[PDB]
Amino acid sequence: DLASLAIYSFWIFLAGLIYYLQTENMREGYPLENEDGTPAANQGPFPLPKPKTFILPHGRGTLTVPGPESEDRPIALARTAVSEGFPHAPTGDPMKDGVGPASWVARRDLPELDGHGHNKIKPMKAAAGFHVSAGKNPIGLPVRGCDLEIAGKVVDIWVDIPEQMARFLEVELKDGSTRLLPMQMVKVQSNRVHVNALSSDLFAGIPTIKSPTEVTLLEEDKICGYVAGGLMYAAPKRK
Template sequence: MGTGSIVGSIDVAQVTLYVFWIFFAGLIWYIRKEDRREGYPLENDVTGEYNKDPWLFLAQPKTFVLPHGNGTVSYPDYSRDTRPIPGERLLPRYPGSPMRPTGDPMKLGIGPGSWAERPDRPDQWHDGKPKIVPLRVAEGFDIAEGDKDPRGMRIFGCDKALAGTVAEVWVDRMEQMIRYLEVDLGTTASEGEGASARRVLVPMTFCVYKKARGAETVVYVHAITSEQFAGVPALASMEQITLLEEEKVTAYFGAGQLYATPERAEPLL
């Protein structure tokens, strides 16, 4: 065919290749839209500004029906986290610069101790009952024969001082594993006679078994000191734990990895 032909050098294989390129580009665009349903549009962490109409890369809201009668949610919902940040930037003009806590970092919810505002209801398994409960509530569950039973073991903080005694084990009935240790901190003289012992939960992922003197097995927690056990966020009920309470309890121990002692926040060299 002569000069100017628009089909003379095009065959089926070439057309197929172009169609694939167009399809693949559209697939990437679609996937990038769908993975931005939560946490988008991004905002400048210095000025707080964000693109309020990101029409190209943000999907239209989709409604999800939650199980067990927990209603519905729609994402993206364009809601912003309006909680004040309890810290000050070391380099105020630069996004992503480090922040210095402006209070007790163990309780501020900043840095490694930050937490998300999850629903204040228990995580549920297939029958709607709470997944994570103490063994005293979990019928048919017990420590497997041959495994260590931490109940009755003494528990120590990173200062190697006694914090309390493990009173109970909390299990995930769906995953069939230990999630938390319930620790009895005892009572102090200032609480008065007859005061009930306070109990807190310690995530099992922050616990290790160690051998003490006399071949006694104890639980060691590197994240916090023995005194800081008293500051672990309390639960509304000692028969179950909500998703929000899980966030706060775990965040407290996460904060301890950096803020439990002054030297942890300092450089190594």
């Protein structure tokens, strides 16, 4: 009868669908590797999908996945054990070296663009007609790290132009130079901006950007990476 045909067909459609979905989710990170960089023996039960090409939009190129994979960067870690499956110790300073929760990826060293081709993120000062509309305005507030020591002062907000959203605080140090802190990692309060991830002495270590009115995807990854890493790696200096 119809209903048991429909149900049986459906479990077949459903297994085909899980197959499609699982292979589609193999377009990044595959083929699997041994801890040493080498293709692993056991690739799992699903084959790689036939590749596909995204056309990027501002003469920015193509992406074709799956494709050859690589960190395009040195990984300062080493084995701590004699077989598969254990942690890999930082061979240096893990914050400086961009590993563990301080990791960053070798994203493209241009800025993300809006639909019109302009830089997506600008310091508010260069963003025409953009002003704070609600909430404590943090500009001018001292910035305090997890040691409860003051690390600098907020000197602008970097805003996403097409989505009208705060993305970073630009913070000035004793130095005179500035750093970006991710908006999602600061707490804005009446008389200060509080940063739990970092202690005051780790502010100078925040990756710097090359031009003062642009950030590249590569630069965002290093900054977000480094301050996220502080949660684990700043923990001895954290009151």
